[PDB]
Amino acid sequence: HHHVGVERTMAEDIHHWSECEAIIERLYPELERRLAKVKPDLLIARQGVKLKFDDFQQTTQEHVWPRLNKADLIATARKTWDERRGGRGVRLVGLHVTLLDPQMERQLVLGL
Amino acid sequence: HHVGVERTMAEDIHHWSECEAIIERLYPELERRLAKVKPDLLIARQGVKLKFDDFQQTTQEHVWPRLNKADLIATARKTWDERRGGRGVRLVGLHVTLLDPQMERQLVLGL
Amino acid sequence: MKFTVEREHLLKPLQQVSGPLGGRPTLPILGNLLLQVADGTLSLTGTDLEMEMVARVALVQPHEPGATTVPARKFFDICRGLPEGAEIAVQLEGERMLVRSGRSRFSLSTLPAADFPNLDDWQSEVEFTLPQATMKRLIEATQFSMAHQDVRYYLNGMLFETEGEELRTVATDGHRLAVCSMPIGQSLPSHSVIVPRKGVIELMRMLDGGDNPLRVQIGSNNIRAHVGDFIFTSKLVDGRFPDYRRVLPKNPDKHLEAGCDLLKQAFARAAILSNEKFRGVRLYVSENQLKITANNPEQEEAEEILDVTYSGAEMEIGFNVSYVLDVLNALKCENVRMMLTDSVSSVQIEDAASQSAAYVVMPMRL
Amino acid sequence: MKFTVEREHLLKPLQQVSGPLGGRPTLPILGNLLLQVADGTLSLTGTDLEMEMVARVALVQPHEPGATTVPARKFFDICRGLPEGAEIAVQLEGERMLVRSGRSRFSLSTLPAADFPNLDDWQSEVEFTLPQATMKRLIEATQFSMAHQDVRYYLNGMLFETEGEELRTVATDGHRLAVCSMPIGQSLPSHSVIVPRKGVIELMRMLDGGDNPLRVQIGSNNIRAHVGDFIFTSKLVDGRFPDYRRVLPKNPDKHLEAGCDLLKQAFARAAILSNEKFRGVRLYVSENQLKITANNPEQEEAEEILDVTYSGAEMEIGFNVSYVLDVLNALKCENVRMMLTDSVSSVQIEDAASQSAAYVVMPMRL
């Protein structure tokens, strides 16, 4: 599987959703630029967000989404933020996608 | 398309045995005539004709796949018994009808 | 464009609109359905550019307007393959349409709504409504006689003619003609149009269970049929269709009557030994009797003899037995009447008890 | 040769002996049925030289002995086309077989009986009887996994193996294998033969709900199945079938159980967006979950998530989805167990609650 992602480790931990949305706003065009390098139509299999907390625990996941799309990334972040942060500071925010997989064309044989 | 043979009688016959003896002599003749145009002797129908002393006649034919004396005799016998009505028979005929040529020409409505 | 609809509200509309989508498509968009959310309605449109079928689905659940096109069969197969009762959430997300239900998620390719063919506006000139089942009997009675790919393009379809209170269909392919008419209980203008055969076949896909009325509108160049929430529109065909009145035998003096099913079964068994390509059978009509015979290249033969009612001159005539059985299968009545003239003239066949339908079949040469 | 039999005593027998005949015969006679009147019995036989079906019909009506062959489909269509209850009188008349009923007459081409191919006779080595439904289960369980036209000719057929009191069928085409075994309640000699795939299909044609048991005779080079008044015979394939044991996964340490139907439907929907040619889907197993994904050259994708029972290490493996569906359609049970090893090794799939059948499917590379 092929992933493309970008992340920012903040100078200082953040504690407020507005800060996180603001970092997402600066990362998005960087992810777009990176992904456009390799997939100019921005078509992907999945995308999602990574938050790494001040204890170095993190949460990520991706969900199906066909392009790579800031609105959806922000929505995902806000839910992960609410919900997983658990009052901790956030040290790093990451956005990523996973590309659609290459086609499977090789069927193995039982070797009779 | 028909192939047939017939015997006109000198004296009218009134007995089935005399009919059957005539058939016995016609049959080879018919086989020969039919073989000239249809060597496998495959036909559509065959049958027999009787002409009567009152100038009427009957011909009785049915589906049968080859010229065949036993079946002609059986047909004749039936015709003899059912149709002769005590009249003299003045001619005996055997005949076949050949399978028809294939139909291939579909006409149009002329729209 | 967003909507959520329960699976069973989407299935029949999806089958209906994926419907004009015959075979493999020539242009990719033609294998797609156009989906449009506007107001509280989702519309789905399938087209092959000659005709189109549109279904409307009320949206009771939250939605957002917009439109796109998606591959018709895959969208249907996804919806169908979801469990009964599934709530199907659809949303357009750039060049993909997301379909989600349960923990099933699919992303289908789209092509822009703006690129979908919109059969252009026209005004209806003629309209009439009738039971679906009446339209279906009219079409079923004649449809088999439409030409397929005759160079006479106006034969590759079906005439629909109104006058008085009658609606009639006529179809012919130069070998045979079928004409059926039914009264539909309203005053109609005298008008007729030719609907292309594939439109007629599609109209037949649309008609089924014969509760809802069918409203038909006919324009100068288009026909539209509305049944429930479905709307079928087809172009019409130009050109001067044959007049069936001139095709009917002028004085087919010889009249024979027979059991429809007896006749049909006899022709069907004779057919087994008819020429596989040419399908010729010969009919021999004599006092109260019909003999049918067939024989083939392999020198096999069949003969059927039937009692019929017939008291006219003896004659012999040949037919393609398929043409005859198509007529007898379309008639499905108790007794038929065949009306004959001579061995090289067409025959007219009708239900002995009804003049609603008539068939004319041109013979083969003996 | 003459007999007279009522229509309905002929129809099934004719249907049955026409089984081996399929399509476009290679010699004319192979498109014919051998009919033989002997004693109070009419025998009908159909063959393709690899196998034959023989049906015997008692003749209660007057008959004369003899034998001939006639075109199987024409003779069938004639008898089927005659009215229900018709008495069909048959007599051989030179070349040509006459068939007459009511006012219908047919003459069919013949080929000489002495000329019909006989699967000449031989010595059963194993004889046993079982319920028709049991044979049907064995065959249905595995037939889909037979190879079709592998150069390894012994794969294009099904192995029948008697061990102990069990009969077992095995099929494989190199990508997957199916094995099913069932108790026959009779001590049986250890023996195994390969029935050609068309013989397996025919044997399946033959089997019917059935009161009657199936008697099976296995020869050196033939198998015979007798059910009521029908006797099927096939040649066997003379080759060495691979040992199925060596292809079973050696140490499946991962065990997944899932509901069979929910699994099948999830695969069936993912399959919609799998590559039309290669049909690849990816399965990701993790704690009590299976995720199936598919994506195609058109850049569409599907994902399904299912709860399953699984506590093993996480792994991903790819499969041709139509192979997995085939197995699931064959198992048709409540829960399935899949035993895996790693992404490049075969999986074994069984009914979680039965050991009667097992399936091994090789994966696709990720």
PDB file of N, CA, C and O in Angstrom, chain B residues 102-103, chain C residues 271-280 295-298 300 320-322, chain D residues 23-24 74:
ATOM      1  N   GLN B 102     -37.733 -28.451 -52.368  1.00  0.00           N
ATOM      2  CA  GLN B 102     -37.761 -27.486 -51.264  1.00  0.00           C
ATOM      3  C   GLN B 102     -38.324 -26.134 -51.703  1.00  0.00           C
ATOM      4  O   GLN B 102     -38.063 -25.694 -52.812  1.00  0.00           O
ATOM      5  N   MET B 103     -39.102 -25.532 -50.847  1.00  0.00           N
ATOM      6  CA  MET B 103     -39.591 -24.228 -51.005  1.00  0.00           C
ATOM      7  C   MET B 103     -38.573 -23.228 -50.463  1.00  0.00           C
ATOM      8  O   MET B 103     -38.204 -23.279 -49.291  1.00  0.00           O
TER       9      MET B 103
ATOM     10  N   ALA C 271     -43.572 -28.337 -38.434  1.00  0.00           N
ATOM     11  CA  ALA C 271     -42.352 -27.483 -38.505  1.00  0.00           C
ATOM     12  C   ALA C 271     -41.086 -28.244 -38.204  1.00  0.00           C
ATOM     13  O   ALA C 271     -40.052 -27.904 -38.689  1.00  0.00           O
ATOM     14  N   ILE C 272     -41.188 -29.285 -37.409  1.00  0.00           N
ATOM     15  CA  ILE C 272     -40.004 -30.046 -37.025  1.00  0.00           C
ATOM     16  C   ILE C 272     -39.315 -30.614 -38.259  1.00  0.00           C
ATOM     17  O   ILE C 272     -38.090 -30.592 -38.348  1.00  0.00           O
ATOM     18  N   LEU C 273     -40.111 -31.052 -39.235  1.00  0.00           N
ATOM     19  CA  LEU C 273     -39.497 -31.592 -40.460  1.00  0.00           C
ATOM     20  C   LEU C 273     -39.484 -30.601 -41.631  1.00  0.00           C
ATOM     21  O   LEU C 273     -39.416 -31.000 -42.842  1.00  0.00           O
ATOM     22  N   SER C 274     -39.598 -29.317 -41.340  1.00  0.00           N
ATOM     23  CA  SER C 274     -39.486 -28.379 -42.428  1.00  0.00           C
ATOM     24  C   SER C 274     -38.019 -27.973 -42.598  1.00  0.00           C
ATOM     25  O   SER C 274     -37.214 -28.184 -41.703  1.00  0.00           O
ATOM     26  N   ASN C 275     -37.710 -27.369 -43.729  1.00  0.00           N
ATOM     27  CA  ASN C 275     -36.369 -26.924 -43.990  1.00  0.00           C
ATOM     28  C   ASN C 275     -35.924 -25.939 -42.906  1.00  0.00           C
ATOM     29  O   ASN C 275     -36.601 -24.921 -42.621  1.00  0.00           O
ATOM     30  N   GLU C 276     -34.839 -26.269 -42.253  1.00  0.00           N
ATOM     31  CA  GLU C 276     -34.353 -25.419 -41.129  1.00  0.00           C
ATOM     32  C   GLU C 276     -34.127 -23.947 -41.500  1.00  0.00           C
ATOM     33  O   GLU C 276     -34.337 -23.048 -40.656  1.00  0.00           O
ATOM     34  N   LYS C 277     -33.686 -23.698 -42.731  1.00  0.00           N
ATOM     35  CA  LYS C 277     -33.477 -22.335 -43.177  1.00  0.00           C
ATOM     36  C   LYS C 277     -34.732 -21.697 -43.686  1.00  0.00           C
ATOM     37  O   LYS C 277     -35.090 -20.603 -43.268  1.00  0.00           O
ATOM     38  N   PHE C 278     -35.473 -22.406 -44.522  1.00  0.00           N
ATOM     39  CA  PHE C 278     -36.546 -21.822 -45.275  1.00  0.00           C
ATOM     40  C   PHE C 278     -37.938 -22.022 -44.687  1.00  0.00           C
ATOM     41  O   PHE C 278     -38.825 -21.255 -44.961  1.00  0.00           O
ATOM     42  N   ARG C 279     -38.057 -23.027 -43.876  1.00  0.00           N
ATOM     43  CA  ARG C 279     -39.257 -23.266 -43.029  1.00  0.00           C
ATOM     44  C   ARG C 279     -40.571 -23.403 -43.785  1.00  0.00           C
ATOM     45  O   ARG C 279     -41.638 -23.178 -43.200  1.00  0.00           O
ATOM     46  N   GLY C 280     -40.496 -23.951 -44.994  1.00  0.00           N
ATOM     47  CA  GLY C 280     -41.633 -24.052 -45.848  1.00  0.00           C
ATOM     48  C   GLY C 280     -42.536 -25.195 -45.426  1.00  0.00           C
ATOM     49  O   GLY C 280     -42.069 -26.353 -45.156  1.00  0.00           O
ATOM     50  N   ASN C 295     -41.429 -31.071 -45.702  1.00  0.00           N
ATOM     51  CA  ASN C 295     -40.371 -32.027 -45.921  1.00  0.00           C
ATOM     52  C   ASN C 295     -39.126 -31.279 -46.054  1.00  0.00           C
ATOM     53  O   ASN C 295     -39.156 -30.138 -46.452  1.00  0.00           O
ATOM     54  N   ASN C 296     -38.015 -31.945 -45.757  1.00  0.00           N
ATOM     55  CA  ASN C 296     -36.749 -31.231 -45.626  1.00  0.00           C
ATOM     56  C   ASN C 296     -35.680 -31.793 -46.531  1.00  0.00           C
ATOM     57  O   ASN C 296     -35.909 -32.807 -47.112  1.00  0.00           O
ATOM     58  N   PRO C 297     -34.502 -31.166 -46.553  1.00  0.00           N
ATOM     59  CA  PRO C 297     -33.420 -31.686 -47.368  1.00  0.00           C
ATOM     60  C   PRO C 297     -33.035 -33.108 -47.021  1.00  0.00           C
ATOM     61  O   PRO C 297     -32.587 -33.777 -47.904  1.00  0.00           O
ATOM     62  N   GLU C 298     -33.279 -33.579 -45.801  1.00  0.00           N
ATOM     63  CA  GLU C 298     -32.841 -34.863 -45.412  1.00  0.00           C
ATOM     64  C   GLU C 298     -33.899 -35.903 -45.847  1.00  0.00           C
ATOM     65  O   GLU C 298     -33.755 -37.091 -45.512  1.00  0.00           O
ATOM     66  N   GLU C 300     -37.051 -36.105 -45.008  1.00  0.00           N
ATOM     67  CA  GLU C 300     -37.978 -36.478 -43.948  1.00  0.00           C
ATOM     68  C   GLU C 300     -39.220 -35.741 -44.240  1.00  0.00           C
ATOM     69  O   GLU C 300     -39.144 -34.782 -44.940  1.00  0.00           O
ATOM     70  N   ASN C 320     -44.033 -19.948 -44.854  1.00  0.00           N
ATOM     71  CA  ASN C 320     -43.037 -20.112 -43.821  1.00  0.00           C
ATOM     72  C   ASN C 320     -43.805 -20.424 -42.552  1.00  0.00           C
ATOM     73  O   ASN C 320     -44.586 -19.618 -42.085  1.00  0.00           O
ATOM     74  N   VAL C 321     -43.578 -21.595 -41.963  1.00  0.00           N
ATOM     75  CA  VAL C 321     -44.411 -22.010 -40.855  1.00  0.00           C
ATOM     76  C   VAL C 321     -44.197 -21.154 -39.593  1.00  0.00           C
ATOM     77  O   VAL C 321     -45.101 -21.023 -38.801  1.00  0.00           O
ATOM     78  N   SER C 322     -42.994 -20.574 -39.440  1.00  0.00           N
ATOM     79  CA  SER C 322     -42.731 -19.654 -38.316  1.00  0.00           C
ATOM     80  C   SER C 322     -43.674 -18.472 -38.406  1.00  0.00           C
ATOM     81  O   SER C 322     -44.178 -18.001 -37.330  1.00  0.00           O
TER      82      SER C 322
ATOM     83  N   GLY D  23     -25.867 -30.330 -28.664  1.00  0.00           N
ATOM     84  CA  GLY D  23     -25.373 -29.311 -29.580  1.00  0.00           C
ATOM     85  C   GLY D  23     -25.145 -29.728 -31.023  1.00  0.00           C
ATOM     86  O   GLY D  23     -26.124 -30.028 -31.749  1.00  0.00           O
ATOM     87  N   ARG D  24     -23.872 -29.727 -31.454  1.00  0.00           N
ATOM     88  CA  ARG D  24     -23.566 -30.045 -32.859  1.00  0.00           C
ATOM     89  C   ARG D  24     -22.708 -31.289 -33.035  1.00  0.00           C
ATOM     90  O   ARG D  24     -21.471 -31.209 -32.951  1.00  0.00           O
ATOM     91  N   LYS D  74     -35.330 -34.456 -33.236  1.00  0.00           N
ATOM     92  CA  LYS D  74     -36.539 -34.471 -34.037  1.00  0.00           C
ATOM     93  C   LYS D  74     -37.514 -35.514 -33.438  1.00  0.00           C
ATOM     94  O   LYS D  74     -38.687 -35.243 -33.403  1.00  0.00           O
TER      95      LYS D  74
END
